[PDB]
Design a protein around this ligand. Structure first.
Ligand SMILES: [Cl-]
Ligand SMILES: [Cl-]
Ligand SMILES: [Cl-]
Ligand code: NA
Ligand code: NA
Ligand code: NA
Lengths: 552, 552, 61, 61, 61, 62, 61
């Protein structure tokens, strides 16, 4: 099958309406991939320990947050990961879906590898390189259907496939965490100089050691140029994702109080009846009156989260994740889990930009009703008295354990049986799409890194690597390795299907839509999604869930 | 049937998707109407002659454009007209359709009158008015199925039903043009004082006199409180309306010339090959070279129209209508038929605004490819020489017949076999929807006042009026009329159905959408479509055809 | 006390409500709205902000 | 066009199960609305005296 | 946030903003629901709605 | 008595109505107090604009 | 899933690294002026994102 293609390139997004507002979005994605031989032929147990006593080391006082120490199993295999919005839709698609649909769900996933080509490189004189075809050479493929091997979402480290169809990409090298004891003590710059920082890493433990190899756990297919490989279709079992945001906060839940009379002019206000004589209910029985702020609501929309909370286990210190909610007027970023990420040119960064530094963006939850304005928050002693003297009210300013900047809001946890909140927004195009659930008896109500969590087993990971291309001289009992310089290219097609539903339209007023404009320096300027004079592209994160929706 | 309702109020817009992108938009509209007795009991042949010698009269020199003289047949009947976008959709609907659909067409029309109530007014002392029910009184209804009577689109004079469901409306009084000779001579302020202006109006002519009465031409239904009336369903036969605009002008048609090399940097330009050596075709064979401007295109997109052309017939002088096209960069309003209209509070004007003056708006064609920039236009003598000396090129500045402001562009007609242009845009909410075609052997390719012209016979006009409520003393041989003061209220429900198709999405870049914003003083500020503190509404014209589309 | 209550339209819901013992798992009974029909007088102008109506009221079971 | 009924009836199906059917009827009074249209009303108690929000420590109000 | 003890010079920020595009929702009964007109001889029924809720214990712990 | 704030304004976070104990810590266990009119319970005889008020203490003792 | 109270800590935000003693609460610091009561003693980290294993069975007691 040498001179015949084994597949079809297709990167078009097709919409099929079944009627009644239901839509079958079928996203085809194809890319040309490049795979080079592994630097090492075997599996390595690598360790990373940044315990320098200067700069961003862990030995310098107060540098816990900079910790990067861990151990990993480095494998000669590579992973083909397309789990990221940017791989399947072009900007316009995302816009169209966000502006017209109100619901979206995963349906099925399929992939195939085809048109494999393997080449060898040899030298010449002047020295120039020459490229030849190794027709008989092959490429190894493996598919972990049952997810035996460690799950490693490439989207988390901007290592998925490129978001540009006409540009080539490459698979990310496979590696996974290995257990290793890790202890690091807490210190501050103010902390005494004589104080010694404990920075330790231990030996591999029997109770937690897990070394897996692709060779020993999965069946492997060999692909020569005339071969091709298919995964067959996988069926998703996940919950629908709302494509709208909520705005009603506790202050907007239920029957608004009855105004006494209609405003007298277009600029006037209206007044309610006296607090003392108004009907209603409160949960503070020390005061005989009702007020929008004291009034009993059905439940609590949103909640206070501990920030910037760091916890520690055998592995080391780590920042506890927080539910991405609205950052409010006050713009309390860390308190409401805003997410900031850095990515490469393959995933959005302007191709024109130069320097090692990646592009960075901070994602602020679309929803406006579940965030928390730490500044304006406060707790009043009871029996409650209004107004309260400084000794019967704890607020932002007040300091905990005599620390100027540590306020109660930093360690306050408001989560409770009455807490209700929306689901994290999907992030085009850098966002991860689906995720494997944690194998623990008691699971989390959601994940921060992805909108769709597989209730059952998630689609299996696709692994590839070049077959060792040996030379004429080879000795097994020698650690020395000689291999012919080889590399390969091949195409990848994937088919992701969604089930989506068109939105209803009942408000009298026009609704907020995701648009583009011509105003210079505007975030939504058309010029950002067009090519430059030399073809440089730029794909910034797009808004989503533009349309508002009743919460109650 | 006294104490039982005879109909249902319904003003909701329902979307039914049949699949494949086809949609059945069913717009229900209902209003409460008020009808008072006619000032006169009979038909009158009224004349209007503004021939004053001062102010806005026709006798003052140079005041032709101010002419209002004409004759009309005033009838005691009223017309219920709902032919206007604003009657059927609330703002959001229009937005949703414009942002998601690409095609729209009329399907069917139905209407009914119900819950009729008639009341009489009598006096009292202090004097106050008392209102009583006249159970036995009735209201007259007539439907002109075959359009025998003169067609009178109420949308043209902002006299259709109100665009607000929760607010009452009233039918417009029926009246129609009657033939009357009319002559008015042309003069200018500069024109000699002794010069006498001829302003004449003649006697009714035998060859063109047409006096119709509702009573003699249509069957009339009498409705007492317990009755109701239905039109049955009418089926439209019209062509589809594109919901996209075009941008390609003659300069963007076909194969762009081949650049020599790609730009060297993101700020650089690229160059084509020398005019003298470039391949291509032109229609000017005096010069041996091709250029984007000289290059032969398939046809002519858009064309030059005579403005502000006034023509005259027996009836009088009148401004010749022009095809609504883009007003260009130059913003030549009158040259590209921009439409300006003035409307009342019932049809958009801010309820808060005070003063007799109506609200005014100027509609500029959405399309950007068929307009004409009169300033930059010009004609070159042939054989053509480049560059041309002042004597071989006619441009804007040059004056016709020694008149400083009259340039060739004012009387230039570019229309020809190669002319191509888009259809006038629909205008929400003041725009007319459908229109009766002119009963002439050779018809116009379109109408300026409406997007849908009925190929066959248009829906018939609905007429109403109160039945003369006589008093105890009545004499036929007397011209004197005595009637009991009476008035009535009744509901009107209408059902208009459209067939529309969801738009495709293929561009890489996000597309322009109709949105709303929070920026103060912005034309699209949300605050414009919300009520005021005392309920004052405001409905401004909304954009349409936001999405661009290939022309070739 | 309130008897039943509509659940909050949020992906992650609360384990209960404080204001009511019964929360509808599905969609709650719909709200019933009423109002008097504008009872107009003999003189009426649409283009006017002024409103004149006959004093009216109603009773029903 | 209807029947007034405000009695509570208990129907025992046996095994301790009961079908409580509560009938409720009331005579209602409806007057015309003060305004004929929809209004976007605002309430702002930002007085600097009494139970206003401008006075120090009066958030709860 | 402020307290009575809080310094007098301290200024209390009390603000209310303009209607936002992202969260504005204006609904009208007329535009969203079908409306029935009832004259004296008419009447109106909702038909039966079926609840789907969990049982409520009538005992305390 | 926890107050939190969003774009809308400050508000008292609701709490699960439980027993108020021997100590009678009302606000700490979400006791509910409400004010109502004559149509809903208040003594018809009572006069003055002020409504009748009652504080509900959870029946449960555990 | 365990927790090493000693190595745990909370950093004030906006977060700065490294933090001066006033913008980081750690084990040592005392609550309400009590030498041995540290924040970790009354800190509740439970939340929607919490996941953990099931208690182990204990043979033979
Ligand atoms: Cl798969
Ligand atoms: Cl009809
Ligand atoms: Cl019901
Ligand atoms: Na922050
Ligand atoms: Na003009
Ligand atoms: Na208490």
């Amino acid at each position: 099958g040498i001179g015949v293609s084994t597949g079809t390139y297709d990167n078009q997004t097709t919409y099929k309406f079944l009627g009644d507002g239901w839509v079958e979005i079928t996203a085809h994605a194809s890319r040309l991939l490049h795979l080079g031989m592994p630097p090492s032929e075997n599996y390595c147990r690598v360790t990373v320990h940044n315990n320098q006593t200067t700069g961003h080391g862990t030995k310098v006082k107060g540098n816990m947050a900079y910790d990067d120490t861990h151990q990993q199993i480095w494998t000669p295999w590579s992973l083909v990961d397309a789990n990221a919005w940017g791989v399947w839709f072009q900007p316009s698609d995302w816009q169209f879906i966000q502006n017209s649909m109100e619901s979206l769900n995963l349906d099925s996933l399929s992939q195939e590898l085809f048109n494999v080509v393997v080449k060898t490189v040899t030298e010449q004189q002047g020295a120039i390189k020459v490229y030849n075809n190794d027709l008989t050479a092959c490429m190894m493929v493996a598919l972990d259907s049952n997810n035996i091997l460690p799950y490693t979402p490439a989207a988390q480290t901007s290592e998925t496939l490129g978001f540009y169809p006409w540009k080539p990409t490459a698979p990310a090298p496979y590696r996974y965490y290995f257990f290793m004891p890790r202890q690091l003590s807490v210190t501050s710059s103010n902390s005494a100089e004589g104080t010694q920082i404990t920075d330790t890493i231990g030996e591999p433990q029997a109770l937690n050691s897990q070394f897996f190899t692709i060779e020993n756990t999965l069946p492997i297919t060999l692909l020569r140029t005339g071969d091709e490989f298919t995964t067959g279709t996988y069926i998703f079992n996940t919950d629908p994702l709302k494509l709208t945001h909520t705005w009603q906060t506790n202050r907007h839940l239920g029957m608004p109080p009855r105004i006494t009379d209609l405003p007298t002019s277009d600029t006037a206000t209206a007044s309610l009846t006296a607090n003392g004589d108004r009907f209603g209910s409160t949960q503070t029985q020390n005061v005989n009156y009702v007020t929008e702020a004291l009034r009993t609501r059905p439940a609590q929309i949103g909640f206070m989260q501990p920030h910037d909370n760091f916890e520690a286990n055998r592995g080391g210190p780590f920042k506890v994740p927080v539910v991405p909610l609205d950052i409010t007027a006050g713009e309390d970023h860390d308190a409401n889990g805003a997410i900031r990420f850095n990515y490469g040119k393959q995933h959005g960064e302007d191709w024109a930009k130069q320097g090692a530094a990646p592009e960075r963006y901070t994602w602020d939850a679309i929803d406006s009703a579940a965030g928390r304005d730490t500044a304006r928050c406060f707790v009043q002693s009871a029996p409650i008295s209004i107004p309260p003297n400084q000794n019967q009210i704890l607020q932002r300013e007040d300091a905990i354990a005599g620390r100027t900047n540590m306020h109660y809001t930093n360690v306050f946890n408001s989560y409770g049986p009455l807490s209700a909140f929306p689901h994290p927004d999907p992030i085009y195009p850098n966002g991860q799409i689906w995720d494997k659930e944690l194998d623990l008896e008691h699971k989390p109500r959601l994940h921060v890194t992805a909108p769709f969590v597989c209730k059952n087993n998630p689609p299996g990971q696709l692994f590839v690597r070049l077959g060792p291309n040996l030379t004429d001289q080879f000795d097994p009992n020698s650690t020395t390795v000689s291999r012919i310089v080889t590399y390969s290219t091949f195409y990848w097609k994937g088919i992701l299907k969604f089930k989506a539903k068109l939105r209803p339209n009942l408000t009298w007023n026009p609704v907020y839509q995701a648009t583009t404009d011509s105003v210079a320096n505007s975030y939504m300027n058309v010029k950002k999604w067009l090519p430059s004079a030399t073809g440089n592209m730029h794909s910034d994160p797009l808004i989503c869930r533009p349309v508002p929706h009743m919460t109650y």
